[PDB]
mmCIF file of N, CA and C in Angstrom:
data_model
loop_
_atom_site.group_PDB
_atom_site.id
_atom_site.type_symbol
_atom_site.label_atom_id
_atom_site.label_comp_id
_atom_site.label_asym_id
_atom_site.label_seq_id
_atom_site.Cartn_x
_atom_site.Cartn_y
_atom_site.Cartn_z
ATOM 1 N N UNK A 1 72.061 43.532 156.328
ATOM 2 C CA UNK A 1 71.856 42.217 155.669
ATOM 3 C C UNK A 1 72.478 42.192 154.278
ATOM 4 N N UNK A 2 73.210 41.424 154.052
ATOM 5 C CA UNK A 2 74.300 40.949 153.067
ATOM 6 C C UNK A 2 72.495 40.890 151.484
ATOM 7 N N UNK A 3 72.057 39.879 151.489
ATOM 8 C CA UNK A 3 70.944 38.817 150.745
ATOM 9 C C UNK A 3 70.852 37.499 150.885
ATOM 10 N N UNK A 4 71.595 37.032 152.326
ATOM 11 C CA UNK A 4 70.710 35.585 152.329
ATOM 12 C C UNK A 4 71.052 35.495 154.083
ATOM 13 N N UNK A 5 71.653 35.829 154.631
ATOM 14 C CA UNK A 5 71.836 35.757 155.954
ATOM 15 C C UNK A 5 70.723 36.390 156.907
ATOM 16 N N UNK A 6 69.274 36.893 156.254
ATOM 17 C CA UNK A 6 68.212 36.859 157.169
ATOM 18 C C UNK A 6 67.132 36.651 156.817
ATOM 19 N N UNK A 7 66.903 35.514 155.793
ATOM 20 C CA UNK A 7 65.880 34.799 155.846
ATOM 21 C C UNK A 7 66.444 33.457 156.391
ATOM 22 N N UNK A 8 67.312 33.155 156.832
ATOM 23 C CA UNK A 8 67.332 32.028 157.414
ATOM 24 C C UNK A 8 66.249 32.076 158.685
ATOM 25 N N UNK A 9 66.382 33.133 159.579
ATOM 26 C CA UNK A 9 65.538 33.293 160.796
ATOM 27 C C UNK A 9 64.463 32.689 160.313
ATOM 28 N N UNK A 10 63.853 32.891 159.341
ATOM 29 C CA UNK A 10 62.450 32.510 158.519
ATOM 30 C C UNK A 10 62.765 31.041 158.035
ATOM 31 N N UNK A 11 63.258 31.043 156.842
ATOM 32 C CA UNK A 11 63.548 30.398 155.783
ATOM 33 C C UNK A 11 64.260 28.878 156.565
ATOM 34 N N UNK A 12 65.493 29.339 156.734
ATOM 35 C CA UNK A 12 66.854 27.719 157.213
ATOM 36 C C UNK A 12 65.367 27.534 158.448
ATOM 37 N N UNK A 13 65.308 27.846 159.548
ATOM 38 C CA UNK A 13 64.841 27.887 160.485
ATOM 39 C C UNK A 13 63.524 27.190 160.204
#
């Protein structure tokens, strides 16, 4: 994980 490409699962989502 980079820092923003896996809270999207959570987060965008």
């Amino acid at each position: 994980v980079r820092r923003f490409a896996w809270w999207w699962p959570f987060l965008r989502r």
